């Protein structure tokens, strides 16, 4: 929701900018979401992906996806149309931020005694930012499939 760190120190400035980079990637991606040969027929490479995207946009459809991957990291979800798709939760940054990082931060008004926490956060935060950057330079469609997209 908000970064209210009032006390300024080299450590606070480090977590705050690291927090801001994460808070920026979410908003940044959220912005993105709203011879011969001449005879060869023309195709639509991502018509299949576009169709799947369109179903996920349907009302109450994401909840179906979220609730199936709540207990496990692999699930087959039946979309409202009729299609079963393999779903995969790769990073759970939610459970990291809420139960390990945010409590540590609040205790001393953003003064982290162990610099390891910022290093762990920036490492935990790295995969999200790198995925965002590829999408941020390639108009939401990347090819080939990077190792950050799918290990």
């Amino acid at each position, epitope marked *: *929701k*908000e*970064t*209210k*760190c009032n006390g300024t120190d080299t450590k606070v400035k480090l977590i705050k900018q690291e*927090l801001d980079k994460y808070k920026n990637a979410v908003t940044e991606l959220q912005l993105l979401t709203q011879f011969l040969g001449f005879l060869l027929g023309v195709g639509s490479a991502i018509a299949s992906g576009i169709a799947v995207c369109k179903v996920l946009h349907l009302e109450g459809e994401v909840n179906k996806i979220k609730n199936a991957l709540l207990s496990t990291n692999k699930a087959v979800v039946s979309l409202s149309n009729g299609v079963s798709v393999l779903t995969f939760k790769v990073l759970d940054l*939610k459970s990291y*931020i*809420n*139960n*390990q990082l*945010l*409590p*540590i*931060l*609040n*205790q*001393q*008004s*953003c003064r982290i*005694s*162990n610099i390891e926490t910022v290093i762990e956060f920036q490492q935990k935060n790295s995969r999200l930012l790198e995925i965002t950057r590829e999408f941020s330079v390639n108009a939401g469609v990347t090819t080939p499939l990077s190792t950050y997209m799918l290990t």
Partner: antibody
Amino acid sequence: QVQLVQSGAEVKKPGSSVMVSCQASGGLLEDYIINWVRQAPGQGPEWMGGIIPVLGTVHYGPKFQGRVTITADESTDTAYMELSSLRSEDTAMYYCATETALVVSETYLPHYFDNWGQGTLVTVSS
Amino acid sequence: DIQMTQSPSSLSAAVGDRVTITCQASQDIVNYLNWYQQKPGKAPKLLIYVASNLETGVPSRFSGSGSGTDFSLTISSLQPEDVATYYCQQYDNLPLTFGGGTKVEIKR
């Protein structure tokens, strides 16, 4: 560095309802997660519930849901706890304990208690 | 509910000894575990949060360790002002639950 001031100890009749208050000095109620913990004589602490004023959400331990009411009056920086239907089990020292809530995300939950009140001993007897 | 098992229930150690207390969880709580100190008649005091982070103003002799289901609280040199009851506490899910407690006494 914020001092939590609870209401004074008192004797309440069995079956009636008691309210314990907790006054914060040096910060706003919104700036914290406000928890209520009780400890019966000879027992450990037990989590009853907590309030998150920044999100307007309250969470209750299963044993206390439906007969415990926790409120946070931000206009006065006063937190309250209302326990109804008193019985023998409720004789206990009641604590007001906080968790700092500067950077709060959605779906934020109570995690720990870094700042405690002095405790309020409620004795239920006639 | 998640049951927290603190062991032993009581111990007697000399001044200057290294004292270790154990807390066991009924399921994996990663490192979402806190430690508190309660002296007789006083409110509990936060000593260790997130398994290993030392609270400010707490003597350097305190340390916390562990991950998964087993955790420890360590005092490298037990001091007279440490006579109290200690509690572990998880926050993986609600309701928050506490350990049974370990009463530490000084043998002189």
